Symmetry: C2
Subunit: 495 residues, 2 copies
């Protein structure tokens, strides 16, 4: 008769919730068609064979038995419908047999799927980079092309066309996949395929002017230079408008009349998120959310429009729509009485108010740049409203999905059925910074309070960071060993 | 204008020939649809996840550059026809494009394929254990069945049916696959799937009375005992006669009228060799061999019936048909130094005559059990004829394919086109013994002067043997690391 929590998804959100949720307090079942967790940041390393699958994964069932002797459950199912009124979900197994499951709480962490932007042919011809199997197919395809072009029945012209690798997307994933292929090409491939090495090329295609546009401008500039120095074709200010079997078309972002047709052998699609069909269907079921393009939750991560307040959502499948400051003006005015109505008066209570309004965090609202003198009540209401409008939901990252998971699981463990049940603070993420590998041993990092821009100890920093981020000693062992293997014996060619 | 050697196959014969052939003296191309070598003895460990793919393989292209600076070639092709009159072969690539290649010498090492004994349904429903992809599919299937049987939509009766693993073949492969599954089931599976552990069973089906029939009787009995002790169903004296989607039928070897119908979830086919289509086609093309079921070579491993004597064959695809003693009686009589034609007179010159007649080897003919007094020329002829008829071709093992490869490559390196042209000795294999893993840390070995029958140090012996048998430091490193990983973290469940 323990309350039942159903987790949907075995990704950064679902798995980390599982890792922290108290199996003694709750009956927990994780449901996912994928019986492992994927350490997504290392996926580009899998495309080149730098790292192995064991570094990049965790088996869900290895974490179902916690040390206090209490256990969770896992079911290999795809959820297809949620029925919030009757508190159950419909799932299917791999053979499309329906199965019905009841819950007391539902944690939706189903992530997102790849976005083709309805561009003709990318679903058909492009390789996505979202999961382990994608990375493995990409590696395999590249190796198949190398062998094909070593055959006598192929002209040099066809070789140059087949050995062009195009990567679409200038964010960290497109950049790292491109960098890993450049390393592989310049090292193991150059040694083992010397007679076709000169025919190989790589292009990276990006709509904006910058590679790694969310990093600093120095890092973007340094990434483009390092790519130039590696003889990678940087097609910034271009985006894809059509894909066919042996060529694709790109469109200049700077001149709508300029188009280019490019031949290619391998096309890697490393950009864009779209909603899962489950979320699209769930949305239509919620009156308040029926025309939404994304699932909205509370500042406490409760799905909005559910009378029972028993469905949560974390990670990439959702956006936070916090309680509105400006619907609570008089109350906020009340909590700071002595002080005149100034922005500084507001900031003075930021610590307390932030527990219920995340948009008041100094990480969310710049009080220096938006300093405001004494205001009338009505003026203060408008200011509050501007803070509401300025609120940005957590970015769709592993970092945020992990932090949301720890927050929410800790709420179930230590708040929900305790004397602290009315003191649940709102979720506020903390930015810890980002790393990207950009080729030829160069690592960049955009962190709070510093930037890293390549250099001899760049890769050492990367390794120190990621070995601590891995979620088991097993993966850490493999992480360490894989770099020894790669240094001593090189990347493998088994396909 | 170096002479061109084409090697067909990247297995034990082809790869080991490549490893020893002098690239300076010859222009060598290896042709195989498989761009790696498979260390087949460790394949059963791959079915359970004890060892990884990197321990079990070698990429061909990593061995194409020898230290002296000279190089070989590899082409990823399947040979389809040999034209021995015009000295070329036809090949196809994976897209069915034909390619024609000329040679001065052709080394046929294409191995064998699995034999279904034309039993209905085994090609449709059974899993073979012949190569890397086979072992991986078997592992995946087993993991899939476990997850399926954890779902709430399945009766206990259906579970017992689906969790029955049947292995067909009581030789070392069937036994080792069975043993590895038993270890996996008893350790990682028992821990991670407690609620269905008791529904799992394994049967091994074998026509004869003995598991490991080619080992000693003590080892065979010990293997059956160990299997009983592990609660494996030992169905010796049974063979499979039909295979359907969810059940198969077996037939008692002891009573023609007794048949059993068995339910199963995973059926593993670990018995039988058949000829490749290439070799079947090649045969019909050679007058002298047109109605043969196997390719015959002479005592120097030259294909018989080829006017140019420039096609060789090694490994599983061939049988040796040595030059006949009894067609050379008079010459043999003259070589003998004796007052009389005795068996002992023959054995006295055995070390010299064995250079041309392998069937005279003490490993091939038992001179003590067939001792013969003074004979007449005609009687000596009949005796010689008995030795001829007693000759057994090298058994189809990696050990023999490897020794044949080193023999033949050494003949090309040091005998062909030198003043030893006419001093080429016949091939005679050396038996080194065999090892088998039979479960729960028990290793058996049947060696020239010892038998090993389990015990605490038997696994230790197994490891020091195989780490020396591996063909690169890369694989040895992985061999060592995989055992540490499996001991510390267990076998993985990633599928
Ligand atoms: C190549 C790559 C590199 C990345 N690198 C970084 C990085 O360096 N730093 C960073 O912060 N972020 C990184 N990310 C982003 C990060 O992976 C995502 O933000 C994170 O995966 C979000 O976690 P999630 O739990 O919401 O979704 P996911 O981790 O994608 O998990 C979704 C889970 O739900 C399951 N699922 C899907 N549909 C259903 C269904 N209908 N029913 C049940 N289960 C379902 C899926 O099988 C999956 O297990 C990277 C992403 C990629 C693709
Ligand atoms: C599971 C298992 C365990 C084993 N354990 C042992 C053991 O412990 N000890 C032992 O001595 N033996 C063992 N063996 C036997 C050993 O693997 C074989 O005897 C050995 O493989 C024979 O070598 P080969 O070169 O003739 O054939 P293979 O090693 O099979 O190589 C044949 C090669 O030819 C290629 N080929 C096939 N058709 C064509 C074509 N038409 N054109 C070009 N190439 C082609 C194949 O891709 C392959 O690369 C084991 C076998 C298996 C399956
Ligand atoms: C689980 C979360 O743990 C946080 C990371 O913890 C560590 C600590 C040490 C290490 C080692 C000792 C392997 C290396 C070090 C000290 C450089 C971080 C790795 C991870
Ligand atoms: C038993 C649980 O695991 C204990 C081993 O955990 C590790 C794994 C890796 C490591 C590092 C990263 C230091 C690598 C190593 C042991 C290969 C040197 C340290 C401890
Ligand atoms: C040479 C590359 O090999 C490695 C791989 C990993 C590491 C780690 C990340 C384990 C470094 C350490 C021990 C400082 C954490 C060190 C060397
Ligand atoms: C403890 C069991 O797990 C580790 C076993 O792995 C190996 C593999 C090979 C070896 C040998 C003995 C062959 C090599 C040696 C002497 C380098 C340890 C030892 C352990
Ligand atoms: C290539 C042929 O080499 C055969 C011998 O290979 C080895 C393998 C392992 C070893 C070590 C050093 C691991 C020692 C051993 C076999 C005694 C454990 C030595 C030689
Ligand atoms: C060629 C370059 O090889 C580098 C060293 O090769 C090895 C590999 C493994 C080993 C053993 C088997 C002793 C295992 C080890 C190094 C993990 C202890 C020794 C030397
Ligand atoms: Mg998740
Ligand atoms: Mg994931
Ligand atoms: Mg996602
Ligand atoms: Mg999500
Ligand atoms: Mg071979
Ligand atoms: Mg092989
Ligand atoms: Mg074979
Ligand atoms: Mg052969």
């Amino acid at each position: 008769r323990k309350e039942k929590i159903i987790i949907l998804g075995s990704g950064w959100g679902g798995f980390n919730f599982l890792l922290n949720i108290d199996f003694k307090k709750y009956d927990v079942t994780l449901i996912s068609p994928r019986n492992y967790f994927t350490f997504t940041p290392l996926l580009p390393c899998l495309c080149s064979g730098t790292l192995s699958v064991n570094v990049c994964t965790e088996s869900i069932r290895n974490f179902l038995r916690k040390k206090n002797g209490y256990c969770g459950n896992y079911l290999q199912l795809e959820c297809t419908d949620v029925f919030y009124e009757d508190k159950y979900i419909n799932c299917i197994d791999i053979e499309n047999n329906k199965v019905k499951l009841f819950y007391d709480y539902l944690i939706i962490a189903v992530g997102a799927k790849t976005n083709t932007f309805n561009i003709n042919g990318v679903d058909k011809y492009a390789y996505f980079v979202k999961d382990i199997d994608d990375a493995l197919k990409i590696r395999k395809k590249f190796l198949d092309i190398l062998e094909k072009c070593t055959l006598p029945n192929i002209s040099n012209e066809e070789k140059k066309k087949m050995l062009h690798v195009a990567v679409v997307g200038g964010g960290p994933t497109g950049v790292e996949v491109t960098a890993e292929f450049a390393d592989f090409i310049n090292k193991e491939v150059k040694i083992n395929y010397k007679d076709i090495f000169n025919f190989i090329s790589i292009s990276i295609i990006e709509g904006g002017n910058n590679l790694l546009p969310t990093f600093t401008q120095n890092i973007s500039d340094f990434t483009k230079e390092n790519f130039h120095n590696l003889n990678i074709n940087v097609l910034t200010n271009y985006y894809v408008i059509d894909v066919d079997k042996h060529s694709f078309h790109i469109q200049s972002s700077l001149n709508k009349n300029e188009k280019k047709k490019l031949s290619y052998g391998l096309l890697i699609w490393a950009s864009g998120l779209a909603q899962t069909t489950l979320i699209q269907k769930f949305l239509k079921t919620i009156p308040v959310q029926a025309n939404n393009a994304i699932l909205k939750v509370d500042e406490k991560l409760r799905v909005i429009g559910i009378p029972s307040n028993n469905i949560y959502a974390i990670g990439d499948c959702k956006k936070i729509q916090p309680k509105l400051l400006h619907e609570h003006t008089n109350e906020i005015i009340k909590i700071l009485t002595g002080n005149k109505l100034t922005s500084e008066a507001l900031k003075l209570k930021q610590s307390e108010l932030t527990k219920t309004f995340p948009q008041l965090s100094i990480s969310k609202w710049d009080y220096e740049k938006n300093k405001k003198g004494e205001m009338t009540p009505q003026q203060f209401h408008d200011y509050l409203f501007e803070i509401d409008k300025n609120y940005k939901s957590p970015t769709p990252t592993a970092q945020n999905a992990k932090q949301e998971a720890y927050y929410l699981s800790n709420v179930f463990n230590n708040f929900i059925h305790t004397n602290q049940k009315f003191n649940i603070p709102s979720f506020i993420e903390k930015w810890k910074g980002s790393l990207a590998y950009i080729g030829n041993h160069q690592v960049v990092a955009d962190l709070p309070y510093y930037e890293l821009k390549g250099g001899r100890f760049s890769s050492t920093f990367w390794k120190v960071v990621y070995i601590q981020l891995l979620l088991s000693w097993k993966s850490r062992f493999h992480f360490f060993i894989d770099f020894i293997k790669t240094k001593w014996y090189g990347r493998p060619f088994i396909k």
